[PDB]
Design a protein around this ligand. Structure first.
Ligand SMILES: [Cl-]
Ligand SMILES: [Cl-]
Ligand SMILES: [Cl-]
Ligand SMILES: [Cl-]
Ligand SMILES: [Cl-]
Ligand SMILES: [Cl-]
Lengths: 222, 222
């Protein structure tokens, strides 16, 4: 089952963006739909030959072949579909499209990892909870120039010149320079607070509202 | 009793600012202390002869007379105190100082009423809960050009041309134009949401004891 392999992408709250690779051009549209344009090379120009159009909730996939299946010149936006389409639920998408769905799925997931959900200004730092929940990335931009980038798999640290190093196990973190273990105590507190605030706002989001409660920016730089 | 005329001012979260009249200068300092410099003019130059230094919570008043009471030329910041001071709790400030305290008190009150606590972007409007709690001003900037400004004694409405009118009682509110009642029901929802969000966030702020949770910016303009 595809739902075993990955979860449906969710592009809610994500800003429009276009990524051009060798394999595809993946776009998050203004409607939060995600499109995968499979581009073919007929030198010099590239043609859009196939399009996967994925719904913002990730559960509807519309596949079509623009220009009668002959192709469209790759443009700034994807070609809109015609009544000639094939369409599937996520749970019903044939495997032949799984790899292409995941192009979108992954891109969305990457964009979420760079999309601020909650920004929290503290005395020493600017905290940013990202959108790739759960286990979202957590960035910490201290004003002195120190940068801490939290992940699920690791914790990055960038010192004031560019001394970059990646910390993994807690046993490796304890072994860090002792003026730094305090920076983490800040960064971890922000993280706890941001997570704390995310929870409370989501709860309030569930009840009657009129617009999303995310993103949120809390406070200001001094 | 002074507690009858005002509440101790509150300058938390308020941005630095300086206002000059002929008789005095009020500043909200970067520390959120509020100063009243009483100014007198001696041959073209103006001197600070008296200073009231009020705590950010409005409950401590330190009063002094710079340069021996002869004065210091009015500068960009108030003259700092010396060993020679008198200092009072709010409830203990002598009447001789009440009108000068009220000078700081009124100014702080004007600033809060113009200082955003919660900014909330909707599909149709930009809502801003001000800081003059309780009964804070709540202004609503619809994108189409309609403006609604909720206030303590009344509700102003500005239509797309400049049709300004004041509603003070339900009798004028029910009697409102029927399509305007639509703008108002939004505005009223925004207020409830913003008030709801204010309460839930302050509560979590109390437990955390770290950088403030206000102001916030919720969402984005479409
Ligand atoms: Cl291009
Ligand atoms: Cl349709
Ligand atoms: Cl098919
Ligand atoms: Cl959510
Ligand atoms: Cl929503
Ligand atoms: Cl002292």
């Amino acid at each position: 089952t595809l739902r075993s392999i990955t979860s449906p992408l969710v592009a809610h709250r994500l800003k429009p963006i276009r990524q051009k690779t060798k394999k595809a051009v993946v776009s998050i549209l203004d409607s939060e739909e995600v499109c995968v344009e499979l581009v073919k090379e007929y030198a010099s120009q590239e043609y859009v030959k196939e399009v996967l159009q994925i719904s913002s909730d990730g559960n509807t996939i519309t596949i079509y072949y623009p220009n009668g299946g002959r192709g469209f010149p790759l443009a700034d936006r994807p070609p809109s579909p015609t009544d000639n389409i094939s369409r599937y639920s996520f749970d019903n998408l044939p495997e032949k499209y799984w790899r292409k769905y995941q192009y979108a799925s992954r891109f969305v997931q990457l964009v979420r990892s760079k999309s601020p959900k909650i920004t929290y200004f503290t005395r020493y730092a600017k905290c940013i909870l990202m959108e790739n929940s759960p286990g979202a990335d957590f960035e910490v931009w201290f004003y002195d120039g120190v940068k801490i980038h939290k992940t699920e798999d690791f914790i990055q640290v960038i010192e004031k010149t560019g001394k970059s190093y990646t910390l993994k196990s807690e046993s490796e973190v304890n072994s860090l320079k002792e003026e730094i273990k305090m920076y983490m105590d800040h960064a971890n507190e922000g993280h706890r607070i941001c997570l704390a605030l995310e929870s409370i706002i989501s709860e309030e989001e569930r009840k009657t509202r009129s617009a999303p409660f995310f993103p949120i920016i809390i406070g200001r730089k001094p």
